[PDB]
A paper describes a structure:
The crystal structure of the enzyme in complex with its product represents the first structure of a carbohydrate-bound bacteriophage-derived polysaccharide lyase. Unexpectedly, the bound trisaccharides revealed two distinct carbohydrate-binding sites in the receptor-binding domain: the first in the solvent-accessible groove of each subunit, the second in an inter-subunit pocket beneath the “rider”. The bound trisaccharides did not induce significant conformational change of the protein (a rms deviation of ~ 0.22 Å from the free form structure between all Cα atoms), reflecting a rigid nature of the β-helix. In the first binding site, the trisaccharide spans rungs 3–7 of the β-helix with main interactions to the protruding loops at T1 and T3. Altogether, the trisaccharide binding to the enzyme is mediated by 13 direct H-bonds: three between the glucuronic acid and amino acid residues Gln130 and Lys291; three between the fucose and Lys291, Glu314 and Asn339; and seven between the glucose and Tyr186, Glu285, Trp310, Tyr311, Asn339, Trp340 and His373. In the second binding site, the unstructured loops of the “rider” domain, the adjacent T1 and B2 of rungs 7–10 and, from a neighboring β-helix, B3 and T3 of rungs 8–11, constitute the carbohydrate-binding pocket. The trisaccharide is stabilized by seven direct H-bonds: three between the glucuronic acid and Arg472/Arg378* (from another subunit); two between the fucose and Asp434; and two between the glucose and Lys177*/Asn217*. In the present study, examination of residues surrounding the bound products suggests that the catalytic site is adjacent to the reducing end of the trisaccharide in the solvent-accessible groove.
Many bacteriophages depolymerize the CPS of their host bacteria through their tailspike proteins (TSPs). The structures not only exhibit typical features of bacteriophage TSPs, such as the central β-helix and the C-terminal β-sandwich domains, but also contain unusual features, such as an N-terminal collagen-like trimerization fold and a striking protruding domain from the β-helix.
Numbering used by the authors:
A (entry chain A), C (entry chain C): 10 to 651
B (entry chain B): 18 to 651
Write the structure that this text describes.
Amino acid sequence: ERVFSDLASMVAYPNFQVQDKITLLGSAGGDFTFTTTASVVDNGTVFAVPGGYLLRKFVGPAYSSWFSNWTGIVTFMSAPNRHLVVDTVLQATSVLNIKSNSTLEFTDTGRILPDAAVARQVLNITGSAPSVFVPLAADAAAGSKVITVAAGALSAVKGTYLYLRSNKLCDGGPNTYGVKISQIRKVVGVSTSGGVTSIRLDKTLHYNYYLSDAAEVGIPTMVENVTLVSPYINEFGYDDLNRFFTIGISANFAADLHIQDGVIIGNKRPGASDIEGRSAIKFNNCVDSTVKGTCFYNIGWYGVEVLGCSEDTEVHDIHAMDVRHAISLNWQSTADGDKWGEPIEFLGVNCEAYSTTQAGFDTHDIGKRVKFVRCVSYDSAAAGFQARTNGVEYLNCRAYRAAMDGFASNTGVAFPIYRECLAYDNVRSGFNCSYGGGYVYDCEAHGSQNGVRINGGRVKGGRYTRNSSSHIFVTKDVAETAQTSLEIDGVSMRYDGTGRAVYFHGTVGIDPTLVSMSNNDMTGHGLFWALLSGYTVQPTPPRMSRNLLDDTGIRGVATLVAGEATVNARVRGNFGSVANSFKWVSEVKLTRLTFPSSAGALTVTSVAQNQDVPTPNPDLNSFVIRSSNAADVSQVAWEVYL
Amino acid sequence: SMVAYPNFQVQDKITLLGSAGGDFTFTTTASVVDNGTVFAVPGGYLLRKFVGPAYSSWFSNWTGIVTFMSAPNRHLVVDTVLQATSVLNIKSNSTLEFTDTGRILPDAAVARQVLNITGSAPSVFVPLAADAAAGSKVITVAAGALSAVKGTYLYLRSNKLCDGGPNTYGVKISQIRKVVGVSTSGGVTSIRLDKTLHYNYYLSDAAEVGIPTMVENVTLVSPYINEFGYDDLNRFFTIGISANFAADLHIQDGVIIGNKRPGASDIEGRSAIKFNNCVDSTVKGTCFYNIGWYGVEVLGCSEDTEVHDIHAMDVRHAISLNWQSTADGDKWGEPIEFLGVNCEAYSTTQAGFDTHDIGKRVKFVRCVSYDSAAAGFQARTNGVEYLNCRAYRAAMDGFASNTGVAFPIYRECLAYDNVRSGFNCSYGGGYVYDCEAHGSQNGVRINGGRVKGGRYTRNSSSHIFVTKDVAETAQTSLEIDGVSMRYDGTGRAVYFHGTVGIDPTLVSMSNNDMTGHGLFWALLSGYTVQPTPPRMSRNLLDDTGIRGVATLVAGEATVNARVRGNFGSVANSFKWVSEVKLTRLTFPSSAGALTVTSVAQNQDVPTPNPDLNSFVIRSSNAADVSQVAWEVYL
Amino acid sequence: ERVFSDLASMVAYPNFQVQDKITLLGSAGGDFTFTTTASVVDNGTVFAVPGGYLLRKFVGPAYSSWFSNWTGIVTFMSAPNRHLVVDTVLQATSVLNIKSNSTLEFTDTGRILPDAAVARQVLNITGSAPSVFVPLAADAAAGSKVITVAAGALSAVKGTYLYLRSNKLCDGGPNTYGVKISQIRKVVGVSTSGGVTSIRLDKTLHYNYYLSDAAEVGIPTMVENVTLVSPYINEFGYDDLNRFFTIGISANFAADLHIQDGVIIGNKRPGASDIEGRSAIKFNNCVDSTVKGTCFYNIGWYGVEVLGCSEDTEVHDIHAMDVRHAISLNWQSTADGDKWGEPIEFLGVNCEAYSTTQAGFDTHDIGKRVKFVRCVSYDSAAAGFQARTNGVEYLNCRAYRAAMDGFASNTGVAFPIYRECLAYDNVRSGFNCSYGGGYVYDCEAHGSQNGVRINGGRVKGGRYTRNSSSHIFVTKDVAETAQTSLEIDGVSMRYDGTGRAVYFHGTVGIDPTLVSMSNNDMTGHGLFWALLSGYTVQPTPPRMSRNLLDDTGIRGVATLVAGEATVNARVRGNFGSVANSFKWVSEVKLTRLTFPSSAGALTVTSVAQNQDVPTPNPDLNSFVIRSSNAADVSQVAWEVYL
Ligand SMILES: CC(=O)O[C@H]1[C@H](O)[C@H](O[C@@H]2[C@@H](O)[C@H](O)O[C@H](CO)[C@H]2O)O[C@@H](C)[C@H]1O[C@@H]1OC(C(=O)O)=C[C@@H]2O[C@@](C)(C(=O)O)O[C@@H]12
Ligand SMILES: CC(=O)O[C@H]1[C@H](O)[C@H](O[C@@H]2[C@@H](O)[C@H](O)O[C@H](CO)[C@H]2O)O[C@@H](C)[C@H]1O[C@@H]1OC(C(=O)O)=C[C@@H]2O[C@@](C)(C(=O)O)O[C@@H]12
Ligand SMILES: CC(=O)O[C@H]1[C@H](O)[C@H](O[C@@H]2[C@@H](O)[C@H](O)O[C@H](CO)[C@H]2O)O[C@@H](C)[C@H]1O[C@@H]1OC(C(=O)O)=C[C@@H]2O[C@@](C)(C(=O)O)O[C@@H]12
């Protein structure tokens, strides 16, 4: 029975015995066990005393309120298998390292305040790359379940990881730095026969790992199974105390790092210039790791930065406000030497970005199997969404009021895919995939200079309004870029008092005949469905099939007399030779409804367009139906398309 | 009695026994008695020693639980069955977590609210110093006009009307924002906001701003309100969880039951969960049974609200975004940015999933309504978007808009066995993209817009019904393209409603599969003069006798084929004929221009045989002997 | 105050009295109360002592570190209303049963290691079927909110459950075993009038329950409200210790069973043959139950198996590696007698499967309202996704490198629905719905022998490349299967140096006229857009409307002279009679642009195609526009389609 009113009196007591019941009162109070066994002092769970150590008695988590200082918290978390609840406002004076099979959980009032004296990292989860590699014993193609090495070359242990690499270049995108391939894999099976060890992997290989590329494998040091529950890093008012940090949570060679909720604030001043490298959360070479629900304010660089061979990474439900990019998959500069790894299998879902200084959601020029689902960007100073790697897919994403494009690719980038994406009031365009093609499926763009900028690919379905120049702008980033075929099919791009339907950019070498336009609603554009600029000679039009140009005077029945009838209808065309124009006329579909013996072959001729001044009346436009038989008295149904 | 012991000292270790037992510290410093963590004793107080959460089993009474939670910064685990006798208020930075057996049973003496999370509107407003357009990051006020503290909130409003929908009450705009930066220069304070403004806030609309006192960062883990059998004990409540001026309120799982008797009449206002002027707040996984009004009610300027994974059974609406009656004076705020995802509703007395006539950026994703007494889904604000939602067995429409409501958007939504229609957007247009409706009177009722893709079957009247709610509603252009609307022994493909003034020439029909309807692809009623048909391009009407090769002899060939047409003058009919595409396959010197004539249709007496229908290919050159490919479309 | 240093000392003490304050120091330590009331000994929370029992005093969860042995853990969880945190490595020697209103939660080091001596089940959550049934008093149609029974036949308590069944057969799929219908429902209201009890249900009925099918109802015993937080069953290295199990988590007649995260490993050796029945998680007759986040390695049977009348089941975010199927909805063999129940309302979302020995994601031939959303299968030894019940829906799913088909139905199975699904490098096909039709909407298949195999239905939109035989293969599983109409519309199926656009399989009786092809991009295929085999007489072609076959020489303007003009253009056709070929020609759309008095009806003739060897030159192809008027001098716009 030993009770102490304060810590100093408890730890000075010389007579502790192993059988004593020991109690401390006050803010870090609790019950303790005396031992002579060497114990790791942290002044929270273990205290030094004369003749031994006091160990706090507890089950379940430890609490930050038990600790005398930050240094002790660091000591405690330097071991694996820790569960610490941050129930106090901690003042960091160093990085907090978290080790495997550990949980750091915050109560609603728990905080880590970074050091105002020195900008540094706050939480680190730090493995490392192998120091030594061994060659594969044989080529391992993409899809391989097993890799092979010489028997005894590598100590592969089931449940631990391998890091594979070769000189093959990352292939997700343009890869201008020439980053080389790597992947992290878990060992799940081992067998040895004929001097070769076959190592079965959790997941299959996503490139060919060939001996001609010096394919090799080593054992990384991973930090696995770390859970960060509601991390609260910094606090509002930080800027008045000059209290910043560099990277909030930095992970390297982590597996199953899961970050839930929390708020990370203030590694730059509010609204201030970007600061290179100062991301809130950084996943470098991390596998099966996620961020879900976290909020970000006033961040110098990226909210969530994903790089190296980070694989099966997901970001859900984040809110990022005043950051450079909310999410950015990154490249690695090879200016000072080789680098390995591109992200593989990335999901961003239900994320929100406001007032990003650069793209809301971003990739650089490497990365594979990147998907954004139901994300939204508001008021970006650049694009809402930027793809710089090939074939990035966007499902039901939305971009509002980007200063440039709602959604864009960039120089050298191939065929982003936009499905049911919606773009509102972005200044330049809704979708800009004029760099290297795009697939724009059932998308909408409203309130831009042009709805879609595109050099090739497909615009299928969707709906476009309030675009001042045109709904679709067939153009390029630069004239040197190749135009490819463009299908525009099933698109609603009606006249609403704003721009034209389609703008063909002769200035950069657009050939309109590489465009095909079928079954589009172009109602109301009249003679001004197309805009053309920069043509030296009148170009040939796109192929056009069964588009709608008018909604009145577009179907009826005429009765031939002596093989002819004149029909008033909104038939349309241009027969001039002006360089920035097309020569074209309506497709008038004719079907015979009575069957006299004088039935002949039918044609449209004598297209006349009323040119009353001041303003033309298109209901007095007309065409003639003429029969090859001069006695024809057939009733003929007529239908007017573009 | 521990609370009677006269000679307590600060030095003591103290122990209570029993169901609320534990270790205690004596103190003289002032403390709020709750008879669970703080007890009054002679000359001072006993404070329970603990780390981590408090437990309801520590408390002598409900009133003590209420006192405990009346402060912020509380974590309480409900590990017992609590009997309420008053409202439980929850304050900022607090968590209320329920164990497997913990419950709050409502007050049986007074039907009242169970949980309240209530911030307050500003007590004073100041005018904006300058116009702030939609998209503004910063607002301005006169220097000294108010004190904007970083991390706290502002409430903006003006006389501009909410613009998400028809807004028949004339609710005015408001939004809640967080202050993230402040600077003052030249007599003007510039306040940087977390999120940008979603309306123009103009001096001419008396745009103004004030400081609300928000309740922020509240987590309700598995709330269990009431229990089965409540009705035998006549034990009800009014609103289960009512929140107003809350930020980051997150409700996870739990079960809320019984503010009406099972299957009983609805009761105005008795929603299970109500979010009024809440920002960044969510309901995920909660189950609802026997609710007099809405499962989750969302109103005021609630912004970035989400409801995921709920199950609601025997409620008025599972989710309803609400208006505010202005009968007694001005009101402000419409919901902005709402997501309902993976929610399920059964046996709703009104629409399964609902909005009233305001609200912006409202999305339902993979929600399902079963056996609604009204619609599965009802949109009363403009441009509500539905992604992969499903409606089964609604008594009226699977999905519907309503009077004056513009263009809901349905993407890959599926409607099964709804009595009246799958989709009813006949009030003000709709966009029906790759949807399906099966088992109704009409698959889609629509006055204008687009039906693109999708598949329709088992609709007794027609797959598509071109009609209006009332004759005074404007018909607009309608595109029907790429739709599978085949004959399956039930209704026709498209019904044109002459009674309400439908002009079929405003409809365009391209590349649809109308196989099997024969002469009965269209239904018409209410016409007194034969209307002109829609434009029609390359639709499929028959699957047999629809392609071949003919050889002209002396400029002509008679071809047996399923060519079709109507050439009569009956008011409720169209004059039309097949589009027969002709292509020449051999190239004699006598090649001339080709045409279709002499369309003849078999009239065999029990049942006509359309394989004996025919047409003639005739050339302008009477010697033409060309081989000619023919293809029959509608 | 009674204080003890060790447990043996404490439980041997002969003189305990109810008023004693009792403390155990050290291991499994804490505070205790003595009682004479019969208590269930578990050597963790309850200990036998002379004259009665010691009960541990605590609030919040129990901990496995309190218990002397596994047997005690089992005893503790044998009662309902338990919260146990597994904070130690437990060695199982028996099945752990979990009862209602209970939570079993694992810390990062907590584990249950199965018994190496005997393969058995690890966790069981086991209710039971009714012991007695009563007939319904009246027919209850699908959609019924209420069922009726004779007053007094059964006592239906609000908040408890009912189990309904009849002799009607399950109707979700082919149901070759003749499994009969059942459902589980919760009672929410009861009233009795005129000798009839009306029972109001939580959810409506999904079949017609008829007296003529012997419709009946009984009270099952359910295990309700069980939460398993991060279950860790077995560990890597298990195979070196021959340490396996049968079923990891087996549930029957459970409601609101929610399993979160965790890892289940090793009921077979890594890469070994499948073992029938050894699923990781099994939900039989479970309602409102979910698996979210769990990882699976080296499983003999299914990752998550769903069977019986399991209703409103969801599987989210799982990773399954080296299993038979990641998810499988199952039938029930009726070889030894009747069985009841098919799954109803199933969602699989954001799940990943690697190296499955059979289909990645599977159903058997029953089940209703089954949906997979954003799931991905890699490197399956069979299909990526297999549907054996009717109308399974797939949204944005992906299949890579399946040994057979990315996505497939099977014998007798109707119309799976694929929306925006993507298939890469699957050996045989991307989509194989040739057994009973399919709906293939905006899908993509790349790197297969054929992109889509299909006998009827719709291929609408989407994009197909790098398919060695053809992009679309119109075929059947067996000749006896009915061909139905097939619509191919809006599909990008261009020539890229690989296969043809569409292959018509005459061998199995395909009539190409049942196929219609509109507005497809077939650019580059030339005369080789179709493959045909097995025809003995030349078949008639599909209907074709406004497809794209060439990208150059496809639009221009000709000027007639004396009623004719020769036009150089990439017009195409075949006029031969070879059995495995079509007779066809380009659709050339002609529109008049000038209107001379000599305007006549216009036609295409004299199609001429260059046949240079080795390489034909399509820039030398031509056709003639001829007018019915011999003096016609019209300018005529021409456009070349297929
Ligand atoms: C590992 C590393 O070098 O990280 C990069 C980081 O990704 C970032 O790279 C930028 C990239 O975002 C940009 O788009 O392209 C540039 C190349 O053209 C590239 O430089 O920023 C640089 C500075 C690196 O960031 C540093 O990384 C780490 C770390 O621990 O991983 C610490 C450094 O701290 C600061 C803030 C710093 O010391 O300046 O930058 C961090
Ligand atoms: C919602 C549903 O149960 O639909 C039933 C539909 O009502 C109909 O029921 C039949 C009824 O016509 C017949 O007379 O009695 C039968 C036996 O009791 C009864 O089954 O048809 C069946 C096939 C159901 O319709 C299918 O149901 C569902 C579903 O989720 O329940 C989806 C199917 O999609 C289609 C359109 C299809 O593709 O065939 O049919 C739906
Ligand atoms: C309840 C039951 O009988 O379960 C089946 C299980 O679903 C599985 O059935 C297979 C099915 O997967 C396959 O596709 O079709 C087969 C019929 O053709 C069918 O047999 O496997 C069988 C063996 C049953 O599994 C057993 O179920 C249970 C249980 O508790 O539910 C325990 C048994 O343990 C083993 C591993 C065993 O004893 O072998 O199998 C389990």
